[PDB]
From a paper:
Rspo (R-spondin, also roof plate-specific spondin) proteins are evolutionarily conserved from fish to humans and have well-documented roles in a broad range of developmental and physiological processes resulting from enhancement of canonical and non-canonical Wnt signalling. ZNRF3/RNF43 specifically targets these Wnt receptors for ubiquitination and turnover, hence reducing Wnt signalling responses. Direct extracellular interaction with Rspo proteins inhibits ZNRF3/RNF43 activity. Here we report a molecular level analysis of the ZNRF3/RNF43 ectodomain structure and its interactions with Rspo proteins.
Sequence analyses suggest a putative domain structure for the Rspo proteins comprising two furin-like cysteine-rich regions (Fu domains) plus a thrombospondin type 1 repeat domain3. We therefore engineered constructs to express the region spanning the two Fu domains of Rspo2 proteins from several species. By using a combination of heavy atom and molecular-replacement-based phasing strategies, we determined multiple crystal structures for Xenopus (x) Rspo2Fu1–Fu2 (highest resolution 2.2 Å), xZNRF3ecto, zebrafish (z) ZNRF3ecto and mouse (m) ZNRF3ecto, (highest resolutions 2.4, 1.6 and 2.0 Å, respectively), plus complexes comprising xZNRF3ecto–xRspo2Fu1–Fu2, mZNRF3ecto–mRspo2Fu1–Fu2, mZNRF3ecto–xRspo2Fu1–Fu2 and xRNF4F3ecto–xRspo2Fu1–Fu2 (at 2.1, 2.8, 2.4 and 2.7 Å, respectively). In the crystal structure of the isolated RspoFu1–Fu2 protein the two Fu domains arrange sequentially to form a ladder-like structure of β-hairpins. Each Fu domain comprises three β-hairpins rigidified by four disulphide bridges, similar to the cysteine-rich regions found in members of the epidermal growth factor receptor family. The connection between the Fu domains shows considerable rotational freedom, allowing a 50°–60° variation in the relative interdomain orientation. The N terminal of the two domains, Fu1, is distinguished by the extension of the second β-hairpin. This prominent loop presents a solvent exposed methionine (M68) at its tip, which we term the ‘Met-finger’.
Numbering used by the authors: 36 to 150
The structure:
Amino acid sequence: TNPICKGCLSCSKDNGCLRCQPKLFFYLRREGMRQYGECLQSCPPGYYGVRGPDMNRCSRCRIENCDSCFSRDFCIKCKSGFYSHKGQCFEECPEGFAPLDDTMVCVDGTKHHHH
């Protein structure tokens, strides 16, 4: 289908939106091998919304093993089998920290080891 260019301040002929209305989130979509600017009310899964200094945008979550990003560097929810710890995703909680198996986070534990 041919994209209709919506919620937009500058609509182009062949590239969708070039500048969204202030409140909408700019999103770059691929149709028939072309890139189209779209203006979304909320970003879709795999992205996070952020207010940049130029516009609201949907940025791609690139954290390894992350399901949902809070921001570029912080994962809110990791994929299956991973624990979140300081915004990253771990198969095992690191030294000093203990797993909570119902929420899949790492929390403060002991640093003592027997000699």
